[PDB]
Ligand binder design. Structure first.
Ligand SMILES: [Ca+2]
Ligand SMILES: [Cl-]
Length: 472
C-alpha cells in the first residue's frame, strides 16, 4: 500500500535532527504520519513553482521556511497537470481543457522499460527505439517527439514534433536505462523530472550541476526519495594540477590551490564565512576559515579561488555561515495570554506580549523579528482571470518588519521566549497596495503571513569530500 513513505519517514526519524523540518508536495509526510499512523495552500503554489519549473524562476527561497529535507514522490507525476498549473507552467486550457472540453494536455507520462521498448499501457503509448531512429506510438497515431534524449549516453535527437495525424505533438521524450518520460514542452525540463526520474535535463547550462549540490539524495525507498536541502552548495571543486585547473572529487591532506564553484539556491550569500571542517570519524578535529563572501548573487554565481592547508582526517566539510532563520515553534504562540496563529501572530497596528516555545538542535544566540511573507499570483496571459489562455505565475516576497528581540540566548532544546512586540500601523496594507499598483487586475493574493522569526549565524553544509591518498 505504501510506496516507500513509511520507510522514508522512518529514516528521517532515525537519521535527522529532532527539530529538523521535512517537506513534500501536498504534504503527504504529515498526512501519512498523522492521519494514518497516529505547507498550507499558499506554499503549494511556491512548491509547484519549484517542481514544475526550471532555470532562474524555479529558484525558490526555501531557506525562509528553514527547510531541511525534501521528499519527492515519483507517483506525483499523476498530479502533474495540477502542479504545473499551480506553478504557473501551463494555462487553464492545457491543465484540464476549455469550455468545449478541448485543449487539455498530458504534462508528464512515465514509460517504464518493456524489454527494448518503453511502454505505458494505461496511456497506450509505445516507444520503439531499437529501430535506431526511435518510433513513438500514441493510440493509433504515430508521433515524432520534438526531441528525444538519452542518459547517461547524453545523446540527443531532434524531431518534427508532429504526429502521423499531422497534428502538433509538442512533447519531449527523455529515455533512461530503467524508465522513460514523455513531457509537454512547457515542462520538459521541470525540476521534478530531474529529482524523480533522474533526467538532468535543463535548458540552462550548469543549472543541473548546481541544483544537485543544493539537493543531495540521502535516501531512497520505493517511489520515494528524500533529499537533503542546502541553499548553499559546491557543485564543482577544481584543483591546480600543472597550471591547469582540473575537476577533483576528494582531497588529500596538505596544501592545495583550489577553485570552488558555489551554487546559491533562492537567496544571496551575505557576509558569510567559508570553512573546511576536518573530520576523523563524524568528529570535527579542526575548523579552517578559508574565505569571506560579502555578497554573491543567487542568480549569478562566480567561482572563488582558495589556498588551504589540510590536516589528515578522513573527510572534509565545506561549511558556510551567515545570518539565517532558526527555531521550531513547539506550541501555539500566545499574545497577551491568548492563543494565536503562528502564521499571523499579530494584526496590523496591534501590540502585545508574545510567548513562544522554541526548539533548536544546538545553542544559538539570535535576534527575533516579525516577518511578513506574501505569496501571490500574477496572471501572465489571457484577457482576465477567467480566460482559458490564462496561466498564473506564483510569487513569494518576504521582508522583515521590525526587530522585537535582541541578543536572545537559545539553548539546545525547548526555550520559552516572552517579549513585547508591536506591528507598525500600515505595513501590511501598504505593501498590498504596492502590489495592486504593480499588477492591477492580474494580481491574486493567496497568502499573507506575519510570523515571529529567530535569526542567527547558522552553518550550511555545502559539500563533504572524503580524504584520499595522492598515489592510489
Ligand atoms: Ca542559483
Ligand atoms: Cl528569511
Amino acid at each position: 500500500e505504501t510506496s516507500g513513505w513509511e520507510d522514508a519517514l522512518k529514516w528521517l526519524r532515525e537519521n535527522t535532527p529532532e527539530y529538523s523540518t521535512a517537506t513534500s508536495w501536498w504534504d503527504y509526510g504529515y498526512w501519512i504520519e498523522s492521519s494514518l499512523l497516529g505547507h498550507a495552500r499558499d506554499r503549494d503554489h511556491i512548491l509547484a513553482l519549484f517542481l514544475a519549473r526550471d532555470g532562474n524562476i524555479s529558484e525558490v527561497d526555501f531557506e525562509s521556511w528553514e527547510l531541511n529535507y525534501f521528499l519527492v514522490y515519483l507517483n506525483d507525476w499523476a498530479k502533474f497537470n495540477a502542479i504545473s498549473y499551480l506553478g504557473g507552467a501551463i494555462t487553464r486550457r492545457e491543465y484540464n481543457g476549455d469550455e468545449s472540453g478541448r485543449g487539455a494536455v498530458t504534462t508528464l507520462l512515465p514509460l517504464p522499460r518493456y524489454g527494448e521498448k518503453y511502454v505505458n499501457l494505461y496511456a497506450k503509448v509505445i516507444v520503439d527505439v531499437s529501430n535506431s531512429s526511435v518510433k513513438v506510438t500514441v493510440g493509433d497515431r504515430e508521433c515524432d517527439p520534438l526531441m528525444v534524449t538519452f542518459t547517461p549516453s547524453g545523446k540527443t535527437i531532434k524531431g518534427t514534433g508532429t504526429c502521423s495525424d499531422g497534428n502538433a505533438f509538442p512533447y519531449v521524450l527523455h529515455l533512461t536505462p530503467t524508465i522513460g518520460v514523455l513531457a509537454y514542452y512547457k515542462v520538459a525540463t521541470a525540476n521534478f523530472i530531474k529529482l524523480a526520474f533522474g533526467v538532468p535535463a535543463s535548458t540552462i547550462p550548469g543549472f543541473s550541476d548546481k541544483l544537485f549540490s543544493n539537493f543531495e539524495p540521502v535516501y531512497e525507498s520505493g517511489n520515494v526519495i528524500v533529499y537533503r536541502f542546502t541553499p548553499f552548495g559546491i557543485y564543482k571543486i577544481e584543483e591546480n594540477i600543472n597550471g591547469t585547473w582540473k575537476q577533483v572529487y576528494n582531497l588529500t591532506p596538505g596544501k592545495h590551490e583550489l577553485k570552488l564553484y558555489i551554487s546559491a539556491f533562492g537567496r544571496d550569500i551575505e557576509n558569510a564565512t567559508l570553512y573546511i571542517y576536518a573530520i576523523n570519524n563524524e568528529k570535527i578535529i579542526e575548523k579552517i576559515k578559508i574565505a569571506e563572501i560579502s555578497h554573491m548573487d543567487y542568480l549569478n554565481e562566480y567561482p572563488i579561488a582558495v589556498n588551504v592547508t589540510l590536516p589528515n582526517a578522513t573527510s572534509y566539510r565545506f561549511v558556510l555561515v551567515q545570518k539565517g532563520p532558526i527555531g521550531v515553534l513547539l506550541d501555539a504562540p500566545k499574545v497577551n495570554g491568548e492563543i494565536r496563529s503562528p502564521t499571523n501572530i499579530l494584526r496590523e497596528g496591534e501590540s502585545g506580549e508574545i510567548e513562544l516555545k522554541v526548539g533548536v538542535d544546538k545553542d544559538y544566540t539570535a535576534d527575533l523579528y516579525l516577518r511578513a511573507t506574501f505569496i501571490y499570483l500574477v496572471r501572465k496571459s489571457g484577457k482576465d482571470n477567467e480566460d482559458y489562455d490564462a496561466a498564473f505565475e506564483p510569487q513569494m516576497d518576504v521582508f522583515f518588519i521590525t526587530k522585537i528581540g535582541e541578543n536572545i540566548q537559545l539553548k539546545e532544546g525547548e526555550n520559552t521566549v516572552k517579549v513585547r512586540a508591536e506591528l507598525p500601523e500600515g505595513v501590511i496594507s501598504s505593501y498590498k497596495d504596492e502590489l495592486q499598483r504593480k499588477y492591477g487586475d492580474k494580481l491574486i493574493i493567496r497568502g499573507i503571513r506575519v510570523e515571529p522569526v529567530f535569526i542567527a549565524e547558522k552553518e550550511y553544509l555545502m559539500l563533504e569530500v572524503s580524504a584520499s591518498a595522492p598515489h592510489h
